[PDB]
């Protein structure tokens, strides 16, 4: 198989992998390359992808993983996966504005993938545990050519149910929930607490998506894309910065005045976003309810 793998241009990178466009048996792929220092994230990500029943319309498609020794005497680990020309949701939102229906399509498809990730499927030979993503954000979501999302980057994800479990501030700082910023996640109910951390981050993703919805800025132009909290903390905020703004001061991204609350759809959208990122983690929507709320919003478009 992998003797015929060709790497082309670099298309992305984060803390753990450098991601290249590639060719495998003359078909296009993406190749995430890890150094030996990040081997454990490769191991983790590969094994999450190989958990039974992980193939799903809103989960990135994994092909194969592999190791090689480089010319200069270094170990490299390669995670080969489907190539998504649109890239991350972050990149896609910076380039596109969408109307109500297509914005809901982005938001619903990412929510559907998270609800599936979060759901335990007792199946013996095919057991799928509930899995927490642990760094959910729009750079770890990819956008398919048909305009729907897939969840990606399981380098930090953890199994939450079943046997041989372990108990664990390692995510992306901008998207950390308040209880994480306080070091006070309730690890006694570990399964629920980790899902609630994910759900807070999904709320921020909702805000980022709908800030680029052409129908929410009528008679006006859509603001340029900005990540959650960028106007308030800039790029690369510090842990302490986020702690004061998000947890101490109880702040969240702001809904524009242009979302004048006389529309029933807009009022409902705002309440669903707020039900995801509230301070009381036990009171946030679950992923399965957010998926249903999102679909019910679309249905309240008639
Ligand atoms: N299969 C893919 N197709 C297209 N772009 C990708 C793909 N996987 C990752 N990327 C891009 O590479 C970036 C980093 O990939 P990711 O797997 O998140 O690495 P890290 O674990 O280092 O954050 C993503 O934000 C995205 O822009
Ligand atoms: N069919 C099953 N598949 C997966 N996990 C199961 C099944 N039945 C029970 N369990 C769970 O597996 C756990 C046992 O894990 P084990 O590896 O024995 O210990 P630990 O997780 O403490 O290291 C129990 O808490 C139980 O809830
Ligand atoms: Mg990263
Ligand atoms: Mg490692
Ligand atoms: Mg695992
Ligand atoms: Mg990433
Ligand atoms: Mg935050
Ligand atoms: Mg429900
Ligand atoms: Mg909607």
Residue numbers in the entry: 199 to 366, 376 to 509
Sentences from the paper on this structure:
Upon ligand binding, bone morphogenetic protein (BMP) receptors form active tetrameric complexes, comprised of two type I and two type II receptors, which then transmit signals to SMAD proteins. Here, using hydrogen deuterium exchange mass spectrometry (HDX-MS), small angle X-ray scattering (SAXS) and molecular dynamics (MD) simulations, combined with analysis of SMAD signaling, we show that the kinase domain of the type I receptor ALK2 and type II receptor BMPR2 form a heterodimeric complex via their C-terminal lobes. Formation of this dimer is essential for ligand-induced receptor signaling and is targeted by mutations in BMPR2 in patients with pulmonary arterial hypertension (PAH). We further show that the type I/type II kinase domain heterodimer serves as the scaffold for assembly of the active tetrameric receptor complexes to enable phosphorylation of the GS domain and activation of SMADs.
Remarkably, several of these mutations (C483R, D485G, D487V, A490D/V, and R491W/Q) cluster to the C1 dimer interface in the BMPR2 kinase domain, specifically at the αH-αI linker. Two sites of PAH mutations—D487 and D485—stand out because they make direct interactions with residues in ALK2 in the C1 dimer model. D485 was not included in our initial mutagenesis and was of particular interest. The D485G mutation is highly penetrant in PAH, and previous studies have shown its dominant-negative effect on BMPR2 signaling in complex with other type I receptors (ALK3 and ALK6) in cells. When the D485G mutation was introduced into BMPR2KD (BMPR2KD-D485G), the recombinant BMPR2KD-D485G did not dimerize with the wild-type ALK2KD. This mutation also had a dominant-negative effect on BMP4-dependent SMAD signaling by the ALK2/BMPR2KD-D485G full-length receptor complex. Due to prior speculations that loss of the acidic charge at residue 485 compromises the kinase fold, we obtained a crystal structure of the BMPR2KD-D485G kinase solved to 2.3 Å resolution. The BMPR2KD-D485G structure revealed an intact architecture of the kinase domain and overlaid with the recently reported structure of the wild-type BMPR2 kinase domain35 with an RMSD of 0.5 Å over 279 Cα atoms. Moreover, like other C-lobe mutants tested (BMPR2-EED and BMPR-EDE), the BMPR2KD-D485G mutant exhibited enzymatic activity comparable to the wild-type BMPR2KD. Thus, we conclude that the pathological effect of the D485G mutant of BMPR2 in PAH patients is due to loss of the receptor’s ability to engage in C-lobe-mediated heterodimers, which results in loss of downstream signaling.
